[PDB]
Amino acid sequence: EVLVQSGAEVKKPGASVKVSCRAFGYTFTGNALHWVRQAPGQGLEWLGWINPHSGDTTTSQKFQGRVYMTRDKSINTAFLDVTRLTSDDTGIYYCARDKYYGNEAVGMDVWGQGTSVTV
Amino acid sequence: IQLTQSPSFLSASVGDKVTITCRASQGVRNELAWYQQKPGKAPNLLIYYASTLQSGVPSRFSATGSGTHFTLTVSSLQPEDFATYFCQHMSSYPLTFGGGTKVEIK
Amino acid sequence: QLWVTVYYGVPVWKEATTTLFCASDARAYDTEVRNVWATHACVPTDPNPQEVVLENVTENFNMWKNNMVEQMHEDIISLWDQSLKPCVKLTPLCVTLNCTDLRGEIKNCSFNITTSMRDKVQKEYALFYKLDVVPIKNDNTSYRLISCNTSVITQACPKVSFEPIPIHYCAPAGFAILKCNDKKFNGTGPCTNVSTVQCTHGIRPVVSTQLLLNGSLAEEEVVIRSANFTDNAKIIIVQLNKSVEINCTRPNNNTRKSIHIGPGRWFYTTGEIIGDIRQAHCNISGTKWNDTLKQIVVKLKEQFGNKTIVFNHSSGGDPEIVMHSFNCGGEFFYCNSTQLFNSTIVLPCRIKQIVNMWQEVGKAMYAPPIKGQIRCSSNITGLILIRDEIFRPGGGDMRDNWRSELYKYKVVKIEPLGIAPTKCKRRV
Amino acid sequence: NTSVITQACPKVSFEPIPIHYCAPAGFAILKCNDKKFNGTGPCTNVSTVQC
Amino acid sequence: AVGIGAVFLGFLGAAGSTMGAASMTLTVQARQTVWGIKQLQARVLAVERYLKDQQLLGIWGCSGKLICCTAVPWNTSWSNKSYNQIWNNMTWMEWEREIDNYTSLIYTLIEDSQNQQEKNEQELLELD
Amino acid sequence: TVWGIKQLQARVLAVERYLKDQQLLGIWGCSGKLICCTAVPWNTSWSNKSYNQIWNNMTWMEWEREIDNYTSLIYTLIEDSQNQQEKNEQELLELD
Ligand SMILES: *[C@@H]1O[C@H](CO)[C@@H](O[C@@H]2O[C@H](CO)[C@@H](O[C@@H]3O[C@H](CO[C@H]4O[C@H](CO)[C@@H](O)[C@H](O)[C@@H]4O)[C@@H](O)[C@H](O[C@H]4O[C@H](CO)[C@@H](O)[C@H](O)[C@@H]4O)[C@@H]3O)[C@H](O)[C@H]2NC(C)=O)[C@H](O)[C@H]1NC(C)=O
Ligand SMILES: *[C@@H]1O[C@H](CO)[C@@H](O[C@@H]2O[C@H](CO)[C@@H](O[C@@H]3O[C@H](CO[C@H]4O[C@H](CO)[C@@H](O)[C@H](O)[C@@H]4O)[C@@H](O)[C@H](O[C@H]4O[C@H](CO)[C@@H](O)[C@H](O)[C@@H]4O)[C@@H]3O)[C@H](O)[C@H]2NC(C)=O)[C@H](O)[C@H]1NC(C)=O
Ligand SMILES: *[C@@H]1O[C@H](CO)[C@@H](O[C@@H]2O[C@H](CO)[C@@H](O[C@@H]3O[C@H](CO[C@H]4O[C@H](CO)[C@@H](O)[C@H](O)[C@@H]4O)[C@@H](O)[C@H](O)[C@@H]3O)[C@H](O)[C@H]2NC(C)=O)[C@H](O)[C@H]1NC(C)=O
Ligand SMILES: *[C@@H]1O[C@H](CO)[C@@H](O[C@@H]2O[C@H](CO)[C@@H](O[C@@H]3O[C@H](CO)[C@@H](O)[C@H](O)[C@@H]3O)[C@H](O)[C@H]2NC(C)=O)[C@H](O)[C@H]1NC(C)=O
Ligand SMILES: *[C@@H]1O[C@H](CO)[C@@H](O[C@@H]2O[C@H](CO)[C@@H](O[C@@H]3O[C@H](CO)[C@@H](O)[C@H](O)[C@@H]3O)[C@H](O)[C@H]2NC(C)=O)[C@H](O)[C@H]1NC(C)=O
Ligand SMILES: *[C@@H]1O[C@H](CO)[C@@H](O[C@@H]2O[C@H](CO)[C@@H](O)[C@H](O)[C@H]2NC(C)=O)[C@H](O)[C@H]1NC(C)=O
Ligand SMILES: *[C@@H]1O[C@H](CO)[C@@H](O[C@@H]2O[C@H](CO)[C@@H](O)[C@H](O)[C@H]2NC(C)=O)[C@H](O)[C@H]1NC(C)=O
Ligand SMILES: *[C@@H]1O[C@H](CO)[C@@H](O)[C@H](O)[C@H]1NC(C)=O
Ligand SMILES: *[C@@H]1O[C@H](CO)[C@@H](O)[C@H](O)[C@H]1NC(C)=O
Ligand SMILES: *[C@@H]1O[C@H](CO)[C@@H](O)[C@H](O)[C@H]1NC(C)=O
């Protein structure tokens, strides 16, 4: 069970970026996906998560109206859609999976490799 | 979630004992995930529900504490553990992680 | 007090045996014009098959107990035989042959045809292989076909094909196939990486001896499975991680004659050769073969000893056991395959037209002469070995070759209805 | 010189008996009752037939 | 504690979760020449399996129900484990095997002690 | 002979059609009902016609064809959003 993300991007401020993450080795719709970012010099910033089955999401208050998540189960792929990019958005964008035992966050042991976005 | 962590320069030698403290103003009860990360890599989980050791994670890793105050202990630190460490809090969200601490070379 | 409550849709099963059905790709439906196995009487495969990986399911597998092998055994034989029902008996053609050498693997034989065209007789000639016919001891000029005193041989209807199309086998509703996805799993025992499959991948009905080909390469190392690696009564199945290329040919542009031996009845026979006589042969990359073989030894020595001498020349059995064989372009080649094992590469091959579906009882099929030259190539993907620590190639039958693929799967039956105690009593 | 011909068994008849063809349960036959209807196209006088 | 989940795996073998948890996907399981002979037998077997389960649910009055409760109490001689020990600490694959030998017993009890008796009592009450 | 085959296949098909409808009615809890209502609301994205426009001004032959592509969607919703959920809620209530 691995997570495979797309490539890196370079954007100017005011731009938007979309980062994919493919569900290799496991059922796409059987485990909710998280998105976490790490800007240079920073710790780990949570952006939100998406339910690959239902399309349900939760996002950080910091990004209301700015960070969106979508999915397309026909290709087993989840996506992170980030707009209003600024210089603070330079960083590594990672996809990750939790155990969701009881449908509640436990901790995430499966991570994608992360992609970088420069702004 | 309103988390304070140990000073980042947690120097230790190999086979030594180094601990990482994660103390938040908000309780999670046990809903805390401990992670280990290397430069250039995604962070990965060590311990979940603040105490269950994930299979595949070495037995030298353990954690104690409850409510608001949790500690990660590496009882026999190895070269591969000179990583940064994080806590993620799950009482509510955003499920951000703390700034992170690092184990340094003694 | 707990109460009995019925729960339906319980995700449990028991191991079970049922019949799997075929599923075709797309083209096979319309290959009925020639192809025996790639029939029209077969539903399509799922264009988007699903697979579910199970989290905590560990089950025992045993490839030598895999009953799917028996189904394939019977199905191939039955379908093959059905296709030959309307074909031509060669019984009256066994009467006589006056032979000389081709101008002696191939004989130029003349013959006397018994009353044919109602009140007429005729004489003809044809080319024959020494592997199909034998001399009369007290003549040494006259010949007969080898199988004549036991049974009937027919000439396959010209409109025939045995192209080994990769037909899939699917489970019926109420059943499921569990697959072992553990790349390091041996032939028996528990497997933890297990997934649910409704239908398997396609498996080509390849017929060969002393060679596993055109599929199923190993996970970056040579993988060897055996029932024991101990008992000399058992055999060893070897999977290669890389294939070895083989190029085979019969560079003789042959023609064929249609001989009528009565109104309404005829058969084809080998006619003249256009051009010279070239020997059938196969080109195997030597370096790839032997580099791989060195690697095979690296894996094999784990069970048999680090300085143990292994892999000697083919030996034991009659020529169809000793020689390597395949249908190149539909033509049947019997190759010495001793060069490959001349140390513990181009091989000569012989041609034979009377064939069995692996092995028949009494009866046999005759492969009609093929017009033009033969050219084919293939992927060597594995070996079957014979214990003597010398190993030699060969052994087994169609079920060993089928098993070498089927080992990945087992069939179970879903048992959704059950009960459990609850705190809830029925209300009335 | 092409094939086999057999003599029909003396006890044989080909009398063209008007056998009916019927649909199985779950199926029905629709009939066009339009006397002026050509070989193709819409028909309005339609009736349900089981056989 | 953040409610992230409510996702779909498919199949859900009774090892991956406990009997209690497993019960949350009963609809998932519910949703889940010679060639002629094979097509035929395959279809016949599918019908037979389907009907056998329906026949039992039918006689028990549990047709149309994913879960139905009966009038028959659990006997600890079949199993003396507590509700928690059965539902939260075991999956169906392991647990059912322990009472496999009581299947016909229980199935019989839930027919006569429940429907033959219940229906006769109710029919008589309904004549008034 | 061939007649047996036809008698057989005809009977098999009749059984298959019968059971398919019963299987759906069964899982939905609509067995024995000519008409059954579900817990799932109508979505106007499937059809935005009014009750009158559908029921009084159209026949079934024309109308069903308009939502043919939502059949699997709706059928799925009326299974999980209704019976799996309803039955789990009721089972728990009945343990008290
Ligand atoms: C392992 O895998 C290899 C390939 O990966 C297999 O070998 C090939 O098998 C195929 C199928 O049997 C062979 O296909 C044959 O090719 C001949 C020549 O093709 C050329 O010319 C035709 C002319 O129209 C072109 O269409 C085509 O694109 C090429 O240009 C055909 O003549 C053969 O047709 C036969 O059947 C028809 C049916 O009526 C007859 O009319 C023909 O006379 C003839 O009998 C056929 O299509 C292919 O040549 C094989 N060799 C190679 C090198 O690819 C191995 O067999 C396989 N082994 C196992 C055990 O699985
Ligand atoms: C494959 O098979 C294994 C078999 O064990 C299943 O294992 C399950 O593992 C999960 C977690 O790894 C268990 O679920 C959780 O159990 C916790 C119990 O406690 C631990 O932590 C405290 C902290 O101090 C310790 O004191 C204690 O000793 C334990 O170490 C619960 O706390 C978790 O939270 C949930 O339950 C609690 C209580 O019900 C509620 O408070 C929470 O609200 C939440 O509901 C959680 O329950 C799980 O129980 C194990 N199963 C069994 C049968 O034991 C695997 O899940 C299984 N499948 C897979 C996919 O691997
Ligand atoms: C149980 O069996 C499962 C099925 O095999 C296991 O899942 C497999 O896990 C391995 C782990 O390494 C994956 O291997 C990786 O695959 C990626 C794929 O990307 C490349 O291929 C795609 C194909 O289209 C292409 O599009 C990309 O551009 C890449 O070329 C590779 O990049 C990695 O190097 C590596 O090969 C398997 O792919 C994965 N299988 C599936 C079906 O996804 C599972 O892990 C097993 N579980 C256990 C416990 O053993
Ligand atoms: C025997 O070995 C040869 C050599 O490896 C095999 O040939 C290879 O077959 C694969 C089949 O997928 C070819 O892949 C191709 O990739 C392109 C990428 O865009 C795709 O468009 C094609 O449709 C196809 O997938 C691969 O190129 C091909 N290699 C060569 C050199 O031609 C051969 O299939 C093996 N035979 C058997 C029976 O396994
Ligand atoms: C397997 O490998 C052998 C060689 O390792 C191949 O033999 C080659 O066969 C061709 C055709 O018979 C020979 O061509 C001849 O070349 C001479 C050169 O002047 C020319 O005068 C002749 O008219 C003819 O063209 C070729 O020389 C020969 N190679 C060698 C080294 O003798 C064989 O064809 C391969 N078989 C397969 C199936 O690939
Ligand atoms: C037809 O008869 C001949 C002999 O009349 C059989 O030839 C024997 O073949 C076996 C095969 O291993 C030899 O061991 C015997 O020595 C052969 N006999 C003689 C006299 O040499 C031949 O096998 C018979 N054909 C069939 C199909 O059984
Ligand atoms: C695998 O090899 C073992 C090796 O001991 C087999 O054990 C046999 O046990 C019987 C018991 O008396 C002995 O008489 C045999 O001689 C043993 N066989 C050998 C080869 O020594 C075991 O049966 C073998 N299993 C398989 C699958 O062949
Ligand atoms: C075979 O050919 C030779 C050639 O001279 C002839 O003498 C002999 O009689 C022939 N035998 C038969 C059986 O025709
Ligand atoms: C497969 O490996 C297991 C490992 O314990 C062993 O017990 C089993 O006998 C092996 N089976 C074969 C056929 O090698
Ligand atoms: C078979 O012929 C092909 C033709 O291109 C060639 O590439 C391949 O290497 C040959 N294989 C062998 C074993 O010579």
Residue numbers in the entry:
A (entry chain H): 2 to 52, 52A, 53 to 82, 82A, 82B, 82C, 83 to 100, 100A, ...
B (entry chain L): 2 to 107
C (entry chain A): 33 to 135, 152 to 309, 312 to 321, 321A, 322 to 354, 356 to 394, 414 to 457, 466 to 505
D (entry chain D): 197 to 247
E (entry chain B): 512 to 543, 546, 570 to 664
F (entry chain J): 546, 570 to 664
Reported in the publication:
The reconstruction shows that VRC34.01 does indeed penetrate between the N241 and N88 glycans to interact with the FP. In the AMC011 trimer structure, the FP and the N88 glycan are reoriented by ∼11° and 16°, respectively, relative to the BG505.664 structure, and the binding angle of VRC34.01 shifts by ∼13° to avoid a clash with the additional glycan present at N241. As a result, and unlike PGT151, three VRC34.01 Fab molecules can bind symmetrically to each Env trimer. Inspection of the FP-complexes of ACS202, PGT151, and VRC34.01 indicated that the side chain of residue 518 is inserted within a hydrophobic pocket in VRC34.01 but, in contrast, is exposed in the ACS202 and PGT151 complexes.
Upon endoproteolytic cleavage of the gp160 precursor, the N-terminal region (fusion peptide, FP) of gp41 (Blumenthal et al., 2012) is liberated. However, bnAbs PGT151 and VRC34.01 were found to interact with the FP, as well as other components including complex glycans nearby in the gp120-gp41 interface (Lee et al., 2016) (Kong et al., 2016).
